Paper text:
To develop an understanding of the structural basis of nanobody binding affinity, we carried out the biophysical and structural characterization of a series of six nanobodies targeting the receptor binding domain (RBD) of [name]-[name]-2 [name] protein, comprising a hit from screening a naïve nanobody library and five affinity-matured mutants derived from this parental binder; two of the mutants have been shown to be potently neutralize the virus. Recognition of the RBD by the nanobodies is dominated by CDR3 and CDR2, with CDR1 only making a few contacts. As a result of binding to this epitope, the nanobody directly competes with the binding of angiotensin-converting enzyme 2 (ACE2) and thus is neutralizing.
Single-sparticle [name]-EM confirmed that the parent [name] and variants [name]-A10, [name]-H6, and [name]-B5 bound to the same one-up–two-down conformation of the [name] that we observed for [name]-H4 and [name]-D4 (29). As previously noted, this arrangement results in additional contacts between one nanobody bound to the down-configured RBD and a neighboring up-configured RBD. It was proposed that nanobody binding drives the [name] into a single arrangement, removing the all-down conformer and various other ones. The [name] protein on its own is dynamic but the binding of the [name] class of nanobodies apparently “freezes out” this motion consistent with the increased entropic penalty for binding. As suspected, we found that the [name] variants reduced the dynamics of the nanobody-RBD complexes as the binding became stronger.
Author numbering:
A (entry chain A): 922 to 1147
B (entry chain C): 728 to 827, 856 to 1067
C (entry chain A): 535 to 620, 641 to 676, 689 to 776
D (entry chain B): 292 to 437
E (entry chain B): 535 to 582
Write the structure that this text describes.
């Protein structure tokens, strides 16, 4: 069942990516930004900045040195300002990209090369594993996560009383279907009979709040009686 | 800090306020105006994204049941107070009360009331269902038993919690009371937020003040130049003013870009804290308050979030 | 008063809306100021009455549209103005025109501001609404009840992350003074700018490879 | 400029270049030939008609002559010693021989000496205001002689 | 053609390599431009 669910999920990833392009927005955005910053830069060549023309050869071919100097100073100021703007924008944007890349590296270490216990760092769920996939100017992680799905109410209790002692579960929780008490692991309903192998003893019954009564089965007694 | 003020500036109106000669000169500079607008719009959209990423971390809006039987823990000071107009808690009210030319301020996409609803949802989930509502469907669990899990998470056996339930609940209540007192008494606690506010305020005062400057022109006022000089010379004076004011705008936008990068870093950290800290129990040392992390409670605040980290 | 006018008082000019003020100038004070050295009030030279200056209403004009691939019908947002100055709806964000106000709340499709989003929905038209934060739900909390999952699912989620940019380089000299000696010799007067820009861009490109 | 290693050393301002790859210069091919193409016209522009006109118009009703479809040898003008003022805006007189234009307008008139200064971009006075106004972005030459 | 040259067409100066083009200029269109608003193609003043 698990293998089938995983295969189905990967198929769904195929379908989603084949159908809709918008999925890769985070990447496309980057591309677009840089594209714009370059279009802008190039367009700023066609500007006059108060000179007689935006083209340099026209000024050079029309004026004498004493005046072409002034016009070219105007153009130089303008274009140098445009370059400084572009370089500053690119520095800031590269800092943002470096942050994304550091996060991507951290994800590939803690997420792909390992199993992360950090919540929502490796997809919404309990992280199982992740698979990296290259992409233009970026990376794509497929995060495989375990998501609890069908849930049931149960009456519960923090301990039980056997012989005036209090038994707490070793790993799991005490639950009740209404009639009998069981103990089960807390992330998947697999009820088990409450025994001394499933629980430990601490103190007495006059302290814990919400404690109940049940019988704790001792595995040894049947063997001794038999 | 999570978000900034979504400021916008009309480069044209800022430089050449309601002046045609000035505007016609400004046309010669090309796309500077557009790119400044674009950068600030980037910032404002980023601000909305920051707030979304931090608070809209829960799909459903949980609400607590009318019964407040949380094994003797008391959450009245952090759950929403129904009597108030804005559905905010006592501590959120304290925090909100502890913070105080072509320029427009765009409003945030989520209102304070929605931020408070998101925090209320997170808080109700964390209380009634523990960490399960981060994983997927919220699964109820008694709060005492949740705390027993949170004790098992830091290597203390669950009997300790059950056997010391009254004492632990009392300590927690006392601590929340101390938080109330701290916020009522000292304002400096919210420095990190106030600072942000002040910074942006300053950056705008500065921007506006740079209009009163001459930059080597005959006057800082544009109509005076237009009404006093002939076109051939008014053009030179206005070019001086335009250069000055355009430089001032570029300065302001660059500073805002850098500051938005700083705020985005803080907001990414806040989102990580709300995921790893609120929606879970973190084993990372000192990421969720000095102690062994037990749980954390978020609380909205002007342009930011506040975590109450409960630690053992 | 109460109109956008181009006013000129004894020395000072401006454009704004002049309104009856409640300020208390001193007998000698002529015109008032804001924190930001901005004129906010004047005294009429002929009648010793004080007038507040409110700048003539202005703001961004934003167009809300589904894709042209979907529809050619759009809405307009006049930002932070009233609906007077211009199927009309006043919102905390400004005046919204061409969108139907709806009581039903939905997931945010096109953000407008202050909790109002818009979308294109069914006879189809554009609608505005207070956006819904999610399905409201209460959890069956009680001191002795626990929900445990009996089954599970395997989800595969996609997380996309940008890693590198385009390693652009610009020859500052050729960009400013393309193949020109007079221009290059003029550029030399600015010092190290060319080198500094080249260096920054080279830093970026090496960072991208890293 | 001796060798590429020397270009590197000079770029880094050091004698002890560390291992790496360094951007030093910019390669650019040099043009081999000069190409000049103009439309094959043989027609002098009728400048005589304008400058050697027997009688001139009043400044208020200044005459305008259009020049088109001809070869303009401006040396004949700027090398003549007959002109007291030869002031060219947005162009240098020497360069005029090397330039083409769609149209030329020869605006001819007569004024008195002290008003000649008013025939220039952005001037003020009776002439510049009420008679003949040049634009602030005027691109051409103003020629005047007693 | 096919050489780096310093060209002047009707005052339009530049430096480049001139090649036979395949652009479908209209009978009236004099020279062409690229996305950067720079001269990309010309019509010889002497030859169409
Ligand atoms: C709670 O669980 C117990 C144990 O699984 C159920 O008791 C069993 O019921 C089946 C038939 O339903 C009988 O065949 C067994 O003999 C019972 N086991 C024991 C140990 O007595 C009980 O029915 C469940 N109660 C509810 C309400 O579902
Ligand atoms: C759980 O079991 C214990 C022991 O059977 C119960 O303690 C008894 O309580 C009753 C009611 O007060 C007394 O009559 C007995 O004397 C108690 N026995 C002992 C040994 O103390 C306890 O009441 C049970 N819990 C519940 C909820 O009934
Ligand atoms: C949880 O704590 C709050 C805060 O101390 C308690 O609210 C106080 O309750 C008393 C008794 O009704 C009132 O006299 C006070 O006015 C309340 N304080 C405030 C600030 O309003 C509340 O009683 C506690 N809840 C429980 C169940 O003990
Ligand atoms: C300027 O002139 C006007 C008119 O001469 C003055 O207004 C008059 O003020 C008196 C005193 O209040 C009134 O009785 C009259 O009705 C007003 N006349 C008019 C035509 O409005 C005004 O006071 C003068 N102000 C100054 C500063 O000299
Ligand atoms: C756990 O959930 C899965 C999927 O929801 C269940 O597997 C489905 O079983 C039904 C009926 O047997 C079939 O119609 C589907 O085709 C199955 N899906 C897959 C992917 O195998 C499974 O029955 C559930 N397990 C329990 C114990 O309830
Ligand atoms: C548990 O019970 C409550 C009411 O007692 C109900 O609202 C809820 O749906 C139940 N949960 C499940 C998973 O059946
Ligand atoms: C649980 O809640 C019920 C109903 O409010 C109450 O009667 C009972 O005392 C509580 N028991 C525990 C152990 O909290
Ligand atoms: C418009 O959208 C549909 C899907 O909604 C898509 O198939 C189509 O390619 C789009 N139109 C164009 C011209 O791309
Ligand atoms: C719009 O105009 C009316 C009348 O001028 C006024 O009552 C109302 O307050 C205005 N709305 C806003 C949001 O200012
Ligand atoms: C929507 O709500 C307003 C205010 O509550 C009310 O006046 C109006 O009748 C409602 N419209 C519909 C269709 O319910
Ligand atoms: C105008 O006349 C003078 C003297 O008669 C002569 O030198 C000059 O060449 C003439 N200009 C022409 C022919 O363009
Ligand atoms: C002059 O140019 C025309 C352009 O149509 C051409 O037909 C003719 O051959 C050319 N003649 C000479 C001598 O260049």
């Amino acid at each position: 069942l698990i293998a089938n669910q995983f295969n189905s999920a990967i198929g769904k990833i195929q379908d989603s990516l084949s159908s809709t392009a918008s999925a890769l927005g985070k990447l496309q955005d980057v591309v677009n930004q840089n594209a714009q910053a370059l279009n802008t830069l190039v367009k700023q060549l066609s500007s006059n900045f108060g000179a007689i023309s935006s083209v340099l050869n026209d000024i050079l071919s029309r004026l004498d040195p004493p005046e072409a100097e002034v016009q070219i100073d105007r153009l130089i100021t303008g274009r140098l300002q445009s370059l400084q703007t572009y370089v500053t924008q690119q520095l800031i944007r590269a800092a943002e990209i470096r942050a994304s890349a550091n996060l991507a590296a951290t994800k590939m270490s803690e997420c792909v090369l390992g199993q992360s216990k950090r919540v929502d760092f490796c997809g919404k769920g309990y992280h199982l594993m992740s698979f990296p996939q290259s992409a233009p100017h970026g990376v794509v992680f497929l995060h495989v996560t375990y998501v609890p799905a069908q849930e049931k109410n149960f009456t519960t209790a923090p301990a039980i009383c056997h012989d005036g002692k209090a038994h707490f579960p070793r790993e799991g929780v005490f639950v009740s279907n209404g009639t009998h008490w069981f103990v089960t692991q807390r992330n998947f309903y697999e009820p088990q009979i409450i025994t001394t192998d499933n629980t430990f003893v601490s103190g007495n019954c006059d302290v814990v709040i919400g404690i109940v009564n049940n019988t704790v089965y001792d595995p040894l007694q049947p063997e001794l009686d038999s | 800090p999570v978000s900034m003020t979504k400021t916008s500036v009309d480069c044209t109106m800022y430089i050449c306020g309601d002046s045609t000669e000035c505007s016609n000169l400004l046309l010669q500079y090309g796309s500077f105006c557009t790119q400044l607008n674009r950068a600030l719009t980037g910032i404002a959209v980023e601000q909305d994204k920051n707030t979304q990423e931090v608070f809209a971390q829960v799909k459903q809006i949980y609400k607590t049941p009318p019964i407040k039987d949380f094994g003797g823990f008391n959450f009245s000071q952090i759950l929403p107070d129904p009597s108030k107009p804005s559905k905010r808690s006592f501590i959120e009210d304290l925090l909100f009360n502890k913070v105080t030319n072509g320029l427009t301020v765009l409003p945030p996409l989520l209102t304070d009331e929605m931020i408070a609803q998101y925090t209320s949802a997170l808080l109700a989930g964390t209380i009634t269902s523990g960490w399960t509502f981060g994983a997927g469907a919220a699964l109820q669990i008694p709060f005492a038993m949740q705390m027993a899990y949170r004790f098992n998470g830091i290597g203390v056996t669950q009997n300790v919690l059950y056997e010391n339930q009254k004492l632990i609940a009392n300590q927690f209540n006392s601590a929340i009371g101390k938080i109330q007192d701290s916020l009522s008494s000292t304002a400096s606690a919210l420095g990190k937020l106030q600072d942000v506010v002040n910074q942006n305020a300053q950056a705008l005062n500065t921007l506006v003040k740079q209009l009163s400057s001459n930059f080597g022109a005959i006057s800082s006022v544009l109509n005076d130049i237009l009404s006093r000089l002939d076109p051939p010379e008014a053009e030179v004076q206005i070019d001086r003013l335009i250069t000055g004011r355009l430089q001032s705008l570029q300065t302001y936008v660059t500073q805002q870009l850098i500051r938005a990068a700083e705020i985005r870093a803080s907001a990414n950290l806040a989102a990580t804290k709300m995921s790893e800290c609120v929606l879970g129990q973190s084993k990372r040392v000192d990421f969720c308050g000095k102690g062994y992390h037990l749980m954390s409670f978020p609380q909205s605040a002007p342009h930011g979030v506040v975590f109450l980290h409960v630690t053992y | 008063k109460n109109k956008c006018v181009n006013f000129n008082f004894n020395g000072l000019t401006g454009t704004g809306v002049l309104t009856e003020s409640n300020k208390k100038f001193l007998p000698f004070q002529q015109f008032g100021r804001d924190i930001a050295d901005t004129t906010d009030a004047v005294r009429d030279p002929q009648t010793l009455e004080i007038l507040d200056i409110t700048p003539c209403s202005f703001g961004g004009v934003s167009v809300i549209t589904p894709g042209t691939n979907t529809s050619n019908q759009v809405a307009v947002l006049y930002q932070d103005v009233n609906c007077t100055e211009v199927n009309v709806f006043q919102t905390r964000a400004g005046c919204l025109i061409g969108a139907e106000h709806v009581n039903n709340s939905y997931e945010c499709d096109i953000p407008i501001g202050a909790g109002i989003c818009a979308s294109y929905q069914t006879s189809q038209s554009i609608i505005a609404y207070t956006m819904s934060l999610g399905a409201e739900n209460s959890v069956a909390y009680s001191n002795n009840s626990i929900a445990i999952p009996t089954n599970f699912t395997i989800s595969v989620t996609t997380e996309i992350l940008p890693v590198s940019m385009t390693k652009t380089s610009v020859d500052c000299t050729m960009y400013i003074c393309g193949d020109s000696t007079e221009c290059s010799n003029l550029l030399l007067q600015y010092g190290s700018f060319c080198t500094q820009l080249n260096r920054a861009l080279t830093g970026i490109a090496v960072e991208q490879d890293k | 400029a001796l060798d590429p290693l020397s270009e590197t050393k000079c770029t880094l301002k050091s004698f002890t270049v560390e291992k790496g790859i360094y951007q030093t210069s910019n390669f650019r091919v040099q043009p081999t030939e000069s190409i000049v193409r103009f439309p094959n016209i043989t027609n002098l522009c009728p400048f005589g008609e304008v400058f050697n006109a027997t009688r001139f118009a009043s400044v208020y009703a200044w005459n305008r002559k259009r020049i088109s479809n001809c070869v303009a040898d401006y040396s004949v003008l700027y090398n003549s010693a007959s002109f007291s003022t030869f002031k060219c805006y947005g162009v240098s007189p020497t360069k005029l021989n090397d330039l083409c234009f769609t149209n030329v307008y020869a605006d001819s008139f007569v004024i008195r000496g002290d008003e000649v200064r008013q025939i220039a971009p952005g001037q003020t006075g009776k002439i510049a205001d009420y008679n003949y106004k040049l634009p602030d972005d005027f691109t051409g030459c103003v020629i005047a002689w007693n």
